[PDB]
Paper text:
In Escherichia coli (Eco), the essential primary σ factor, σ70, binds to RNAP to form the σ70-holoenzyme (Eσ70) that is capable of recognizing and initiating at promoters for most genes. Upon locating the promoter, Eσ70 melts a ~ 13 bp segment of DNA to form the open promoter complex (RPo) in which the DNA template strand (t-strand) is loaded into the RNAP active site, exposing the transcription start site. Although only half the length of DksA, TraR regulates Eco transcription by binding to the RNAP secondary channel and mimicking the combined effects of ppGpp and DksA. To help understand TraR regulation and principles of the regulation of transcription initiation in general, we used single particle cryo-electron microscopy (cryo-EM) to examine structures of Eσ70 alone, Eσ70 bound to TraR (TraR-Eσ70), and Eσ70 bound to a promoter inhibited by TraR [rpsT P2; Gopalkrishnan et al., 2017].
We also determined cryo-EM structures of Eσ70 alone and the Eσ70-rpsT P2 promoter RPo for comparison. In Eσ70 without nucleic acids, this channel is occupied by the σ701.1 domain which is ejected upon entry of the downstream duplex DNA. We noted modest changes in clamp positions, but we suspected that conformational heterogeneity of Eσ70 (limiting the resolution of the single particle analysis) likely arose primarily from a continuous distribution of clamp positions that could not be easily classified into distinct conformational states. For Eσ70, three major components (Eigenvectors) of clamp changes were revealed. For component 1, the red and blue particles gave rise to reconstructions that differed in clamp positions by a rotation angle of 2.7° in a direction we call opening/closing. Component two gave rise to clamp positions that differed by a 4.6° rotation about a rotation axis roughly perpendicular to the open/close rotation axis, a conformational change we call twisting. Finally, component three gave rise to clamp positions that differed by a 2.0° rotation about a third rotation axis parallel with the long axis of the clamp, a conformational change we call rolling. The same analyses revealed that TraR binding significantly reduced the range of clamp positions for each of the three clamp motions.
Residue numbers in the entry:
A (entry chain J): 248 to 333, 343 to 691
B (entry chain L): 460 to 562
C (entry chain L): 50 to 52, 94 to 100
D (entry chain J): 741 to 888
E (entry chain I): 3 to 1342
The structure:
Amino acid sequence: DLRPLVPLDGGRFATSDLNDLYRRVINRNNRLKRLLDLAAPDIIVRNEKRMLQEAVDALLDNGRRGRAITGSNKRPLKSLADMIKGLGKRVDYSGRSVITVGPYLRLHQCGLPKKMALELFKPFIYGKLELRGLATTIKAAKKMVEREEAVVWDILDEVIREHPVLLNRAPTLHRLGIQAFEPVLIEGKAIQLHPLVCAAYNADFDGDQMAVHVPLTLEAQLEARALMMSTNNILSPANGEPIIVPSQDVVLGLYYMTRDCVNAKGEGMVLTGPKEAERLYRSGLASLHARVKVRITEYEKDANGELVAKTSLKDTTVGRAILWMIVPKGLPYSIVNQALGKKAISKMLNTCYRILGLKPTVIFADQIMYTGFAYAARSGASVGIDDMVIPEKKHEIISEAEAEVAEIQEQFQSGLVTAGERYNKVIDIWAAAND
Amino acid sequence: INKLNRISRQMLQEMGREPTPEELAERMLMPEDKIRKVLKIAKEPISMETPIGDDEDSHLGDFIEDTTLELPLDSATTESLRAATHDVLAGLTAREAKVLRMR
Amino acid sequence: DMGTTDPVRM
Amino acid sequence: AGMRGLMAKPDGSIIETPITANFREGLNVLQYFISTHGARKGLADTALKTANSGYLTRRLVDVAQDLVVTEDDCGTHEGIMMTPVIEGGDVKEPLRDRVLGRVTAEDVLKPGTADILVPRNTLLHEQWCDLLEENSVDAVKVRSVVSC
Amino acid sequence: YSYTEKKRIRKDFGKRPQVLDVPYLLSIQLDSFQKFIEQDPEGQYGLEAAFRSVFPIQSYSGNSELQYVSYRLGEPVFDVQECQIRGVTYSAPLRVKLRLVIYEREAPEGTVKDIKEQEVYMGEIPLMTDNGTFVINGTERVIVSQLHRSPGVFFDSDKGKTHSSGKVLYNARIIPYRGSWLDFEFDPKDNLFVRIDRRRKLPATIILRALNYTTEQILDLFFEKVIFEIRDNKLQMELVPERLRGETASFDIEANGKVYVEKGRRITARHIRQLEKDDVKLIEVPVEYIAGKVVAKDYIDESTGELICAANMELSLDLLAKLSQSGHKRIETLFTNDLDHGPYISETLRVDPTNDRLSALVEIYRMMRPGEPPTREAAESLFENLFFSEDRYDLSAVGRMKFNRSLLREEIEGSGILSKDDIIDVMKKLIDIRNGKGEVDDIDHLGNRRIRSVGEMAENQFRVGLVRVERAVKERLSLGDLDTLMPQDMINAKPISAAVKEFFGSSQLSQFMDQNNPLSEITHKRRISALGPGGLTRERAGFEVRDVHPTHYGRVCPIETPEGPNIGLINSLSVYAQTNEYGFLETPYRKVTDGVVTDEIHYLSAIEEGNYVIAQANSNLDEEGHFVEDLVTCRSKGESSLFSRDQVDYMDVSTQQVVSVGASLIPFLEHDDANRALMGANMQRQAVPTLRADKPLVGTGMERAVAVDSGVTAVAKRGGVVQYVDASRIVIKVNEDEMYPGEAGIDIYNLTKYTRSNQNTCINQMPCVSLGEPVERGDVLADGPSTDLGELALGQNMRVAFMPWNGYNFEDSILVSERVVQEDRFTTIHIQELACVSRDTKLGPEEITADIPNVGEAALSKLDESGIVYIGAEVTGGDILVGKVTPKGETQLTPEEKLLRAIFGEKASDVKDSSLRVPNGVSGTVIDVQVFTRDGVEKDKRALEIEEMQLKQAKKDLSEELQILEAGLFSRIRAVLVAGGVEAEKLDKLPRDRWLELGLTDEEKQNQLEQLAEQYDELKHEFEKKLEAKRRKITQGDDLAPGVLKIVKVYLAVKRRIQPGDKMAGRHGNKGVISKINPIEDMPYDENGTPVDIVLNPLGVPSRMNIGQILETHLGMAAKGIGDKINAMLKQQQEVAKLREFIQRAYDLGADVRQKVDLSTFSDEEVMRLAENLRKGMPIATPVFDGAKEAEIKELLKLGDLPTSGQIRLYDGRTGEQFERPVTVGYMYMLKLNHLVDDKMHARSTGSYSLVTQQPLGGKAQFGGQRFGEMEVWALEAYGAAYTLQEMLTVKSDDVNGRTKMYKNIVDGNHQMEPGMPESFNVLLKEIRSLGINIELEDE
Ligand SMILES: [Mg+2]
Ligand SMILES: [Zn+2]
C-alpha cells in the first residue's frame, strides 16, 4: 500500500514508478532462469546476467547508471534513494485571515470572528451541548449546531472563556514569532490585533495573513499560559531594552503634548494640581502648551522598601502636568520634563520596568497608548504643499557651482590638467555644494 | 485495438472531420456497445509524479485523497450506542437478556 | 564529490 | 527640499553631473531616467538578503543546538578579562553596558584597595554596577561560557 | 467628433503641441498572424516558405518524386460564442494539395506517364478572434512575445575571473539559426583553439587542415613577407621603412654610402622620414639576423635532389649554410613585432598533432562521437554534412545581414550557408581585435536582440511536424509500386495535430488572460518574456541582463515590471515603438535640417541612433520652428551634453515615449519616486469593475485610445442615424454617400449580456445613445465593464481628508464611513459556475431523480419533478441544487445497531448521495441551467424544454433579422423611385409583393432596383438554408470524455458588499486594509455641514517619497469646486448667457495652452447638455511628463471662492470641538482590488485524508491546514515548550489510531492524549528496510 494502484475517476489509473521497476527486475530474472535451464550458448547468458545486473542496480539507486527512463513521458523516474533523499507537516485546527488594527482592547486579547471560532471549537461545543441537557446525542448536536439556533452562542461564549490560541505570522524569523493570546469574540471577518505588538512581528497592515492554531490538552494549555503569553515577553532576547516601544502615531501625539510655546492663551497663572490642569484644558480656556507653574507630589522608595512623600512648586507646562496623571508612584519627576521624543520614551518604560516589576509596566503601557491616540486625534497634524519650503539660496549656489565646473573644463581643454584629476575635482565641487 | 486504430486512421482522412464512436462501428460489424469498453481498456496509467506548479513544486500524488477511513462521529456514534443498548437491556429479566444476547 | 560501461555497446 | 545628491551608474563610480532638481519641482526626463536605474538596483538587491540570512541561520542552528543549562555550580575560578572597548579615539561601548549581568569570578578591588569592595561570587545588577561605575574601577574579571 | 466629445469636453493643461497621434495599440499580434497565413506567390513569411523547404521529396533513385502546388484554408464549423460555450477548439481545416509523379527507366527527364492529385487532410491551425485572443478549450488565451539573442556573429571580452592578473582572452562565436554552433578562443598560453558545440576542445587549424588548405597558403594568407638577399656579399636585406616602427635597433644603418642611424639609438620619425625622403632600399644586416625569423617558401636542393628548408622551420645559421651553399639568393621571410603582429598560429601549429586531411577527419569523427571505430567515407560524409548542406545548418537572412554588418562588407543579401571566405574573416577579425584595431561588442545593447511573436513560433512547430511526417513517407516510398496507391495512405494526420495543438495548449509561453478590466487585457497582449524555449531560464540571470542599459530609452519601458522572483525580465513596450522588417525594435523621431523644423516623421532603428546627435522634446521651439536657447540639452552616445543651436539632426516626437501603456495614466508622475510609481503601475492592473463606474477627475489624456482599442465597445462602422435602441440590439441606418450601390438596408449590432469572464467577473454592455441622434465613424455605441461615455473609469472619486483619527488608521489602515456602503458605490457582482457529473459506476449507473433518502421536505421545495433547480430560486448556502443518487451493494451491518433495526424499520437499495450543494457562504440567484447529454439516451423533460426554448429563440431572431432589414430596403426602393417618376398615392394602394413589378425607363436606379430585387431574393433563399443548418446544429448530441452520461450545470450570481478586509488602494502607491466602517454622524464635518468619507494617514508621505498625491488632492478639490459652483448656478433656472460667460472663463485660464474651444460654433441646445453633464465636476487633464505647475492650481482654486492655501478648518463630530492646526481635504481617486476577505478566510476541524502518507489534505472543497515548517519548530523549541510540540506533530497530524482515541476523549469530557508513533517514521523503516540494510528497535 506504500506503492498503491488507486483508481482515478473514470477508467484511467495512477501509480508510483516502483511498479514498473519491480516488473522489469522480475521479468529479467524469469528470463534468465528460462535461458539457463535450456543450456544456451555463452554470449546470450552473459548479456542476460549483465542486463539483470543493470536492472537491480537501477532499482536500488537510479542515477549512477544510464538512467532508465519510462515510455510515454520523457521524465526520469525515481526509486528508493529519492524516497529518502527528500518543508511541512500539515496540521488540523488551523485557519488564516487578513488583519486589521482595533485599538480598543488590552495587550493580551486579540479578536476572533464568530465563524472561525465555530469551525474550530466544534468538538468542545459537541461535548458541552450533549452534557448540559439540550440534546440527546451527538447526532442531535450536529443537527442543532449547523442550522445555527440562538442557544449555541452562549455555549460558545462559555467555552471561549480563558482558553488560549496561538497567533503566528508566515515567514517566522526569530523567537517572538509565536506568541499566545486569549480571544474575544467579535463580529466581522478579520482577526483583530494590537497596535503595540505589531512592532515585533515586522508586520505591516497592508494585507498580511496570520494563522491561528489551538492547543488541546491540559499540559499544553497550562504551558501556553505560564511560559509564552503576550505579557511575559516584553524583554527582547537580543538585548536589554524593551521591544514595546510605540511606533507610528502615538509618538507624534506624545511629542505634541509635551512642548513649550512662548505665548499661548492663559499663560502665567498658577494652578493647584494635575486634576485642575486637566480641567483647565477641557474648559477651552488655556491652550495645551504654555509655561505655567504648578505643584506636584513625587514618591520615592530609596529607603528600605518604603514609599516616602514630597511636595514642591515646579516649573512646567500644562501638557506634562496632564501626562503626570498616568505614571505610577515609583518614578521621579525627571522623566516627564523633557521634550519626550522616542529615545526618552524607550528609557521611561525601561526605568519603570527596572524599578517596580511587571504589572505597573503593563498598565503603564496600555495607558500610554490610549493617551497617545486621543491627543494625536485632537491635534490634527497634517501636511499640505505649502510646508516644503525650498530655500532662497538655490539659484545662486547652483550658479556658482555651474561656473566653476565650466572653468575647470576650459582649463582641461587647454591641456593643463588630466582626465582623472579633472574627474576628481568635479566630484569634490558638487559634493560640497550639496551639503 | 490495432484494428480499431488502423481503420480509424484510414477513416479520418476521407470523410473529413473525426470518427464518431458509432459510425466507427459500421465499417466493422461490431455490436456498437463493445467499442466503449475496448477503448476504455486501451489507455496506459498515469505516473503519479507529473508535477503541477501550485505556487511551489508539488505532485499529483498528494492531492489524491482517501476513500476507506470512516469519520470519527461514526465511531463516537457507535460508542454511544453500545452503552445505550447496554443500559436499556439491563432493565429486563435474566431470560430475556440471555435470549437476546445470544440471538 | 571532490573538494565504456553501457550494456548496448558491449 | 534640496538637491537629491548623486546617483550612480552601473560600473559603480558616480556620474559627474548630478541631479539639480527636487521633488516639489519637476523631475524632467533625463534625471528621472538616471534615478530609475538606482531604484531598480536597490530593489533587486533587497531580495537576496532574505535567502542569505535564511542560510546563515540554518547552518548556525545545526551546529549549535545540543546545549542545555544543566547544573548550578561548576566550581572553577578563571574567566575572561573585561575592559571598555576603544576603536582608536573616543570610546564606543563603556563598561556599564558590557559587564551588566554576568557573574564576577575573583574579587574586585580599588588601587590602594583597603579591603574587598564586592564579594567573590555575586551577580551584577544595577546597584553593584553603579558601585563599579562610581569608584571608577578599570578592569573587571568575569566568568564566561568558553572557560566552563 | 460630431457628438462624442461635443458633450463633456475634457479641459486640457500642458504646453507643448504634438505631431504624431497614438497608433493602434494591438498592431503586433494582428500583423504577425496576418502574415503567417496569406497567399503570396514567393517565399517570405508564408506557409509557402514552410512547404518550399521540405518539399519536393525524391527517393533514393526510386523514380517517384513527390511535389506540391497549393493549399487552402476552410470554414470554421462553429462560431466563437457557441464554440466557447461548448468547449472545442476554434478550429479551421487545412487541406493541402500534393502531387505524385513517377520517373522512368534510363532517362532523367523522360516523359512521365502518371499525373495525379488528391487532397490530403492534415491537422488544424487555430484561427484568431479579432481582438487578438486565441480560443482553445473554452477559455480565452493570449500568446506572449519573446526576445532572444540574434543569429549571427559577435565577439566577447570576458575579463576578470580568469587567472587574476589581467590576461584577457577574446573568444568569437558564430551562433546560427538552426543547427550546431562554432567557436574560436584563446588561452593564457596564447595559442588559438577551435571548438564544435560544447563537447570537447581541440587545437585550432584542424578545420583548415581537413578542408583542403595546406601550410603554404595559410601562412601566405595570414602573415606578410620581406626579402632577404645574400647577393654573394654579407646578408643584404631590402626593407620597408614602416617595419622599423616597433623594431628595437640592433645594428648599424647605412646605404648608398649614407649613414642613417647609429647602433643603440632607436630609430625615430626623423630617420623614417629620411628613408621616405630619398627612397633607400637596401640595408646590410649581421649574419645571425635571421636568428629568429622563418622563411616562407619550400626549398629544394640544387643538384643532389633533397630538401633543405621548407616553411615553418627553426631557421639558424647551420641551416642557412645548408641553404646558401647552392645558389638560393632570393629569400622571403616573415615580419614580426610583439605589439603589432603576434604569430600565435605558429605555436599552435607547433603543438598540432595532425598534418593532413584524412587524419584531421578521423580526429573530428573520433572527437564528436565517443568510443567509435572510424572509416574514411563516414568521416567525409559527416564533415561535409554538418557545416555545408542546406538541411542541417540554416543561418537565415537575419543572421546573414548581421554577419555582413559585423565584418564590414557591403552587400546585404547572400546565401543561407557559409562558404570559405567567412572562417578566414572571423579569424582575421579575432587576430585584429587581439592586436588592437577594432574592439569588442557586448549583449543587451538591443542592437543584438530581437522579437518573434506568433508567426515564427507557429512556423517552427509546423516545420518539426513536417519533417516527422516526411521521414516516414520517404522510408515507406521505397517499396511503392507503380500505380495502386494514391497520396492519402502514406501521410497520416496525428503528429501535426499533436504538435501544434500541444504548443497552443500547454507550453510555457501561452498563459491564461487576466480578463477583469479594459486595462489588463491590453497590457497582457503585448509583453516581452525572456523565459521559455530558446532563452535564459529563471535562475541563470546575474546582474548584467536584469538591469537597465541605456539603449532602452524609448523602445522598452523602464519604470514598469513584475516584482518578486523574476524582476527585470518581463518589461513591456513603449507607446509608439514598432517592429521593423527583420525584427529589431524601433522608435519614431522628427527630421530637423534646421530648415525651420520639418514636420515629417522618420522611423529609426537601434544602432543608427549611435552615430548622431539628438535633441530633447522638453526644449522649447519658438514660433514656427526656430530654437531659442543657444545651448540645447542633447545626447550623442548615451551621454547628455550641451551643443549649439545648429548641427542637431533629430528631435524627439512628444514627451510620452518613455513609459508603458499602464504607467502613462498615473497623473503627476513627474514627482513620485520610481519605487512607488512601480507599485502604482503594478496595482492599476488589478481593479475589479463596480456597478456604475463614474469617470476620473484628474486623469491623463491617454485614456480614450486605451478604452477604444481593446475592443469592448461596439464602435460604429458607418455613420448615420439611430433607428431603434433596445437593451440587447442596436439598429443604425446609414447615410447616402457612405453607402454601397446595393445591399444598403441597415447595419445591426448584437451585444453580449451577462457572461462569466475568465476570472469570475461580470461583463455586460449598455447602449449610450437616444432615439434620433447622429453618430460618426469612431464614436462609441456601447459602454463596457468599467467604461463611461467612451472614457476609461475604474474607481469612484470620494473625499479624503488627511488626519490621524483616534488610532483606527494606525499603520496603513483606511477608514470608510457608512455613506459609501449605503449609496452603493463599491458593490460588485460575481458569477460562479458549479458543475456535477453523472458517471458510470460498476454496480449500476446514476440517475437524476428528485427523491433522495435521509432527507424530508425541508430542502426539496425548490425542485421541480425532473430534478434540477428552478430559474430564479434565491438559494442560500447549503441547499439542494441537483439530486443525484448512486447505487451501492454489500451492506454488511453491525451488532446492536442491527438489534435496533430489528425493532422499528429499515431502508435499503439506494445509498450515499453525492448530490452537490452550494458551498458555504454564497447567497446566489440561479440565472442559467444547461443540460448536455450523450447521444443515445432519451433525455427527460428539462432537456426537451431547454431545446424547445432555444429553437424558438433562434427562429425569432432570424425572423426579426429578415423583418427589420427589408423595411429599410423597401423604404430605399420607394424613396428612389419617387425621385423621377413620382406617383401621387400609387405607393400605398397595391401591396409590397406586387410592388417590384412596376419597372422604369432606362436609368441607373432601374438597375439598382433590379439589383435590390435580386438581393432580396437571395436573402429569401439564405434565410431558409441558414435555419436548416441552425436546427441541425442545435438538435444533435455532443462528444464527451469516456465514462460520463450527462452533465448538469448551474450559474450562480453572487453580489458582494465591502467588509473589514477588502484591500483598497489609490492609484500611485498606498495600499490599505479597510479597518472600521463608521456611522455617518461621527465623521468630521467642515463648517458647511458636509461629512467626509475616508480618513488616510499623513505619516506615509515623508517616509516613502511620493509627494504627488498631496498635489493631486488639491487639484481635484478645485475641480469639484468649479463643479458645485455651476450646480448652484443651474439649481435656479436663470439664463444661458451666464453659463456661456462662466464656462468660457473656466476654459480660457491664463497661460498659453492648446485648448481654445467655446462660444461660437455651439448651439443653444448644446450648452444645456454640457452644463447638464458638468454638474458633477469639470474634468481636468494632464500630459504626464509635461504636467501642471503651482500657479495654475492656485488660479483654478481662485476661480471658485475657496481658500487658496489648500487647507480648510475642520470641526470634529463627536464633541463639537474645533481642531487646532487646520488640515487638508480634497478629492483623490480610489480603485477596489480583488484580495477579498471571503476569498482568504478558511478553517478546518476534521476533514479528509491522503493515501500514501496520512497527513491532512482537503480535496472535498474543504481547506487543509497551515503547514508547520521548521522555523516555527525552532521558535517553539526556543521556549520551554515540549508538550505543545509533541502534541502538534504526533497526535493532531500523523497518527492513525491516536486521533480517534483523542477525539472520543474530547467529546466525552476528559482532556488527555496518548503519544503513539508517527506515520513518517513508521514508513521510513519500510522504505529503508527494502534495501539491504537492517534497522531494529531493541531494548525494553
Ligand atoms: Mg506587506
Ligand atoms: Zn561554569
